[PDB]
Amino acid sequence: RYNGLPSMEILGQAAPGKSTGEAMELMEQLASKLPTGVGYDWTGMSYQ
Amino acid sequence: DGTMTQEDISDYVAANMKDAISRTSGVGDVQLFGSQYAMRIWMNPNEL
């Protein structure tokens, strides 16, 4: 659970040459095309 | 669209929104103008 709601933590790296900014931007895009009632958020190293 | 009553709104605010708003930055206290849903067992003394 993350911030009181049921959650699932997903870890990964930006591909060689690409920055973490480019990687997260695509993860948000793919996250947007998921089923209804499924949101997302950034935690830990991605939060700061 | 009048698909939800006053109690249905009150429950949704209480169950999905109130907790997250109460943990939001600089929010001291949060009063719900309504009540969260509970399993109401409305007893009949005649049938009892």
Short mmCIF file of N, CA and C in Angstrom, two decimals:
data_model
loop_
_atom_site.label_atom_id
_atom_site.label_comp_id
_atom_site.label_asym_id
_atom_site.label_seq_id
_atom_site.Cartn_x
_atom_site.Cartn_y
_atom_site.Cartn_z
N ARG A 1 0.86 -1.21 0.00
CA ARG A 1 0.00 0.00 0.00
C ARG A 1 0.89 1.25 0.00
N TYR A 2 0.54 2.25 -0.81
CA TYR A 2 1.24 3.56 -0.92
C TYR A 2 0.25 4.70 -0.67
N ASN A 3 0.51 5.51 0.36
CA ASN A 3 -0.33 6.65 0.81
C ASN A 3 -1.76 6.15 1.11
N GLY A 4 -1.88 4.98 1.73
CA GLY A 4 -3.15 4.45 2.27
C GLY A 4 -3.93 3.59 1.29
N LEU A 5 -3.58 3.62 -0.01
CA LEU A 5 -4.29 2.89 -1.09
C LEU A 5 -3.50 1.65 -1.48
N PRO A 6 -4.16 0.58 -1.99
CA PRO A 6 -3.45 -0.58 -2.52
C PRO A 6 -2.51 -0.18 -3.67
N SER A 7 -1.25 -0.63 -3.62
CA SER A 7 -0.17 -0.23 -4.55
C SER A 7 0.66 -1.45 -5.00
N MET A 8 1.55 -1.24 -5.97
CA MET A 8 2.58 -2.22 -6.42
C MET A 8 3.82 -1.46 -6.90
N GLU A 9 4.94 -1.63 -6.20
CA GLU A 9 6.22 -0.92 -6.45
C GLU A 9 6.90 -1.53 -7.69
N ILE A 10 7.27 -0.70 -8.66
CA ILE A 10 7.96 -1.10 -9.92
C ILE A 10 9.29 -0.33 -10.02
N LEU A 11 10.40 -1.05 -10.18
CA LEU A 11 11.77 -0.50 -10.30
C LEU A 11 12.28 -0.71 -11.73
N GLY A 12 13.20 0.15 -12.18
CA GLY A 12 13.81 0.08 -13.52
C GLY A 12 14.85 1.17 -13.72
N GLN A 13 15.66 1.06 -14.78
CA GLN A 13 16.72 2.03 -15.15
C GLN A 13 16.42 2.63 -16.52
N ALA A 14 16.82 3.88 -16.74
CA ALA A 14 16.88 4.54 -18.06
C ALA A 14 17.94 3.83 -18.91
N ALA A 15 17.62 3.52 -20.17
CA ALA A 15 18.49 2.77 -21.11
C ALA A 15 19.81 3.52 -21.30
N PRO A 16 20.90 2.83 -21.69
CA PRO A 16 22.20 3.48 -21.91
C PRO A 16 22.12 4.67 -22.88
N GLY A 17 22.65 5.82 -22.46
CA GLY A 17 22.64 7.08 -23.23
C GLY A 17 21.49 7.98 -22.81
N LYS A 18 20.29 7.41 -22.65
CA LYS A 18 19.05 8.13 -22.22
C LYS A 18 19.19 8.54 -20.75
N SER A 19 18.53 9.64 -20.37
CA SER A 19 18.49 10.18 -18.98
C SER A 19 17.27 9.61 -18.25
N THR A 20 17.25 9.73 -16.92
CA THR A 20 16.15 9.27 -16.03
C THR A 20 14.87 10.06 -16.34
N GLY A 21 15.01 11.33 -16.74
CA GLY A 21 13.90 12.22 -17.14
C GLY A 21 13.12 11.67 -18.32
N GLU A 22 13.82 11.16 -19.34
CA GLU A 22 13.22 10.57 -20.57
C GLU A 22 12.48 9.27 -20.21
N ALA A 23 13.11 8.43 -19.38
CA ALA A 23 12.59 7.11 -18.94
C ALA A 23 11.25 7.29 -18.21
N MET A 24 11.22 8.16 -17.19
CA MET A 24 10.03 8.42 -16.33
C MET A 24 8.88 8.97 -17.18
N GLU A 25 9.19 9.84 -18.15
CA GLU A 25 8.19 10.48 -19.05
C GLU A 25 7.41 9.40 -19.81
N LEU A 26 8.10 8.38 -20.32
CA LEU A 26 7.49 7.24 -21.08
C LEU A 26 6.69 6.36 -20.11
N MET A 27 7.23 6.08 -18.92
CA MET A 27 6.56 5.27 -17.87
C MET A 27 5.20 5.90 -17.53
N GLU A 28 5.15 7.24 -17.46
CA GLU A 28 3.90 8.03 -17.21
C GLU A 28 2.93 7.84 -18.39
N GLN A 29 3.44 7.87 -19.62
CA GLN A 29 2.64 7.70 -20.87
C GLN A 29 2.01 6.31 -20.89
N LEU A 30 2.80 5.27 -20.64
CA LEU A 30 2.35 3.85 -20.61
C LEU A 30 1.37 3.64 -19.45
N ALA A 31 1.61 4.31 -18.32
CA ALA A 31 0.76 4.27 -17.10
C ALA A 31 -0.61 4.88 -17.40
N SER A 32 -0.67 5.88 -18.29
CA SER A 32 -1.90 6.63 -18.67
C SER A 32 -2.84 5.73 -19.49
N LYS A 33 -2.28 4.76 -20.23
CA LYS A 33 -3.03 3.88 -21.17
C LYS A 33 -3.51 2.60 -20.46
N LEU A 34 -3.41 2.55 -19.12
CA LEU A 34 -3.80 1.37 -18.30
C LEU A 34 -5.31 1.38 -18.07
N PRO A 35 -5.90 0.27 -17.57
CA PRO A 35 -7.34 0.22 -17.27
C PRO A 35 -7.84 1.34 -16.35
N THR A 36 -9.15 1.58 -16.35
CA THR A 36 -9.85 2.62 -15.55
C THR A 36 -9.70 2.31 -14.06
N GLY A 37 -9.44 3.33 -13.24
CA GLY A 37 -9.30 3.23 -11.78
C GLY A 37 -7.87 2.92 -11.35
N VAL A 38 -6.93 2.85 -12.31
CA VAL A 38 -5.49 2.56 -12.06
C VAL A 38 -4.69 3.85 -12.28
N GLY A 39 -4.19 4.45 -11.19
CA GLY A 39 -3.31 5.63 -11.20
C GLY A 39 -1.87 5.23 -10.91
N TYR A 40 -1.00 6.21 -10.65
CA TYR A 40 0.44 6.00 -10.35
C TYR A 40 0.99 7.17 -9.52
N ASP A 41 2.26 7.05 -9.10
CA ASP A 41 3.00 8.07 -8.32
C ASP A 41 4.49 7.70 -8.31
N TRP A 42 5.36 8.68 -8.01
CA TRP A 42 6.83 8.50 -7.85
C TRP A 42 7.19 8.60 -6.36
N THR A 43 8.08 7.73 -5.89
CA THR A 43 8.54 7.65 -4.47
C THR A 43 10.07 7.59 -4.42
N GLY A 44 10.64 7.72 -3.21
CA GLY A 44 12.07 7.55 -2.92
C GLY A 44 12.96 8.44 -3.77
N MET A 45 13.83 7.82 -4.58
CA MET A 45 14.85 8.51 -5.42
C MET A 45 14.17 9.31 -6.54
N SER A 46 12.99 8.87 -7.00
CA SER A 46 12.20 9.51 -8.09
C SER A 46 11.45 10.74 -7.58
N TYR A 47 11.08 10.75 -6.29
CA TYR A 47 10.33 11.85 -5.62
C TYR A 47 11.21 13.11 -5.54
N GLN A 48 12.46 12.95 -5.11
CA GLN A 48 13.42 14.06 -4.85
C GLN A 48 14.26 14.36 -6.11
N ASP B 1 -25.31 14.75 -12.62
CA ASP B 1 -26.16 13.81 -13.40
C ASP B 1 -27.17 13.10 -12.48
N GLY B 2 -27.14 13.39 -11.17
CA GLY B 2 -28.13 12.93 -10.18
C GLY B 2 -28.17 11.41 -10.05
N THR B 3 -27.03 10.75 -10.28
CA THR B 3 -26.86 9.27 -10.16
C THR B 3 -26.40 8.91 -8.75
N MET B 4 -25.87 9.88 -7.99
CA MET B 4 -25.42 9.73 -6.58
C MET B 4 -26.26 10.63 -5.68
N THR B 5 -26.68 10.12 -4.52
CA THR B 5 -27.41 10.86 -3.46
C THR B 5 -26.40 11.62 -2.59
N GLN B 6 -26.89 12.28 -1.53
CA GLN B 6 -26.07 13.05 -0.55
C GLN B 6 -25.15 12.10 0.22
N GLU B 7 -25.67 10.93 0.60
CA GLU B 7 -24.94 9.89 1.38
C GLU B 7 -23.85 9.25 0.50
N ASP B 8 -24.14 9.04 -0.79
CA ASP B 8 -23.21 8.45 -1.79
C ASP B 8 -22.00 9.38 -1.98
N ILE B 9 -22.23 10.70 -2.04
CA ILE B 9 -21.16 11.74 -2.15
C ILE B 9 -20.34 11.70 -0.86
N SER B 10 -21.01 11.80 0.29
CA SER B 10 -20.41 11.81 1.65
C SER B 10 -19.49 10.60 1.84
N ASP B 11 -19.92 9.41 1.41
CA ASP B 11 -19.14 8.15 1.48
C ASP B 11 -17.89 8.28 0.60
N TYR B 12 -18.05 8.72 -0.65
CA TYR B 12 -16.95 8.82 -1.65
C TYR B 12 -15.89 9.81 -1.15
N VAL B 13 -16.32 10.98 -0.66
CA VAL B 13 -15.43 12.01 -0.05
C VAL B 13 -14.66 11.37 1.11
N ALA B 14 -15.37 10.66 1.99
CA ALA B 14 -14.85 10.05 3.24
C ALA B 14 -13.85 8.93 2.91
N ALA B 15 -14.16 8.10 1.91
CA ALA B 15 -13.46 6.82 1.62
C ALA B 15 -12.25 7.04 0.71
N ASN B 16 -12.31 8.02 -0.21
CA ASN B 16 -11.32 8.20 -1.30
C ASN B 16 -10.53 9.50 -1.15
N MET B 17 -11.14 10.56 -0.60
CA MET B 17 -10.59 11.95 -0.64
C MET B 17 -10.11 12.41 0.74
N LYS B 18 -10.91 12.20 1.80
CA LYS B 18 -10.69 12.79 3.15
C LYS B 18 -9.29 12.45 3.66
N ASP B 19 -8.90 11.17 3.60
CA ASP B 19 -7.61 10.65 4.15
C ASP B 19 -6.43 11.35 3.48
N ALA B 20 -6.41 11.41 2.15
CA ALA B 20 -5.32 12.00 1.33
C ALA B 20 -5.23 13.51 1.59
N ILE B 21 -6.38 14.19 1.68
CA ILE B 21 -6.47 15.66 1.96
C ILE B 21 -5.97 15.93 3.38
N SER B 22 -6.24 15.02 4.33
CA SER B 22 -5.85 15.15 5.76
C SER B 22 -4.33 14.94 5.93
N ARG B 23 -3.68 14.28 4.96
CA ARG B 23 -2.21 14.02 4.95
C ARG B 23 -1.50 15.02 4.01
N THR B 24 -2.25 15.93 3.38
CA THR B 24 -1.72 16.96 2.45
C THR B 24 -0.93 18.01 3.24
N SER B 25 0.07 18.62 2.60
CA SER B 25 1.05 19.57 3.21
C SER B 25 0.33 20.78 3.82
N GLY B 26 0.45 20.96 5.14
CA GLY B 26 -0.03 22.15 5.87
C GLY B 26 -1.47 22.03 6.34
N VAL B 27 -2.13 20.90 6.08
CA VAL B 27 -3.53 20.62 6.51
C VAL B 27 -3.50 20.12 7.96
N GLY B 28 -4.05 20.91 8.89
CA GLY B 28 -4.05 20.62 10.34
C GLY B 28 -5.15 19.65 10.73
N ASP B 29 -6.40 19.96 10.34
CA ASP B 29 -7.61 19.16 10.67
C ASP B 29 -8.58 19.21 9.49
N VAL B 30 -9.41 18.18 9.33
CA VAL B 30 -10.39 18.02 8.21
C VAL B 30 -11.72 17.51 8.78
N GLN B 31 -12.76 18.35 8.72
CA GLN B 31 -14.15 18.00 9.14
C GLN B 31 -14.96 17.61 7.90
N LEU B 32 -15.51 16.39 7.89
CA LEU B 32 -16.42 15.90 6.82
C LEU B 32 -17.84 16.41 7.10
N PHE B 33 -18.41 17.17 6.16
CA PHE B 33 -19.83 17.62 6.19
C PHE B 33 -20.69 16.51 5.57
N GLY B 34 -20.96 15.48 6.38
CA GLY B 34 -21.54 14.19 5.98
C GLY B 34 -20.98 13.06 6.83
N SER B 35 -21.14 11.81 6.40
CA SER B 35 -20.62 10.60 7.09
C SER B 35 -20.23 9.52 6.07
N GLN B 36 -19.19 8.75 6.38
CA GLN B 36 -18.76 7.56 5.60
C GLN B 36 -19.80 6.45 5.79
N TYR B 37 -20.02 5.62 4.77
CA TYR B 37 -20.98 4.48 4.81
C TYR B 37 -20.51 3.45 5.85
N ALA B 38 -21.47 2.81 6.51
CA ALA B 38 -21.29 1.66 7.42
C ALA B 38 -22.37 0.63 7.11
N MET B 39 -22.17 -0.62 7.53
CA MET B 39 -23.17 -1.71 7.34
C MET B 39 -24.27 -1.54 8.40
N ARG B 40 -25.31 -0.76 8.07
CA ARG B 40 -26.45 -0.44 8.97
C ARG B 40 -27.39 -1.65 9.02
N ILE B 41 -27.50 -2.29 10.19
CA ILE B 41 -28.46 -3.39 10.48
C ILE B 41 -29.66 -2.79 11.23
N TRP B 42 -30.69 -2.37 10.49
CA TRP B 42 -31.90 -1.70 11.03
C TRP B 42 -32.86 -2.75 11.60
N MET B 43 -32.81 -2.97 12.91
CA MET B 43 -33.53 -4.07 13.63
C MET B 43 -35.02 -3.73 13.76
N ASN B 44 -35.88 -4.75 13.62
CA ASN B 44 -37.35 -4.69 13.87
C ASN B 44 -37.64 -5.47 15.15
N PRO B 45 -38.17 -4.82 16.22
CA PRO B 45 -38.41 -5.50 17.49
C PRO B 45 -39.55 -6.53 17.45
N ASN B 46 -40.55 -6.30 16.59
CA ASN B 46 -41.72 -7.20 16.40
C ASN B 46 -41.24 -8.56 15.88
N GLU B 47 -40.43 -8.55 14.82
CA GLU B 47 -39.86 -9.76 14.17
C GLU B 47 -38.81 -10.39 15.10
N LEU B 48 -38.08 -9.57 15.87
CA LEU B 48 -37.13 -10.05 16.91
C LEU B 48 -37.90 -10.81 18.00
#
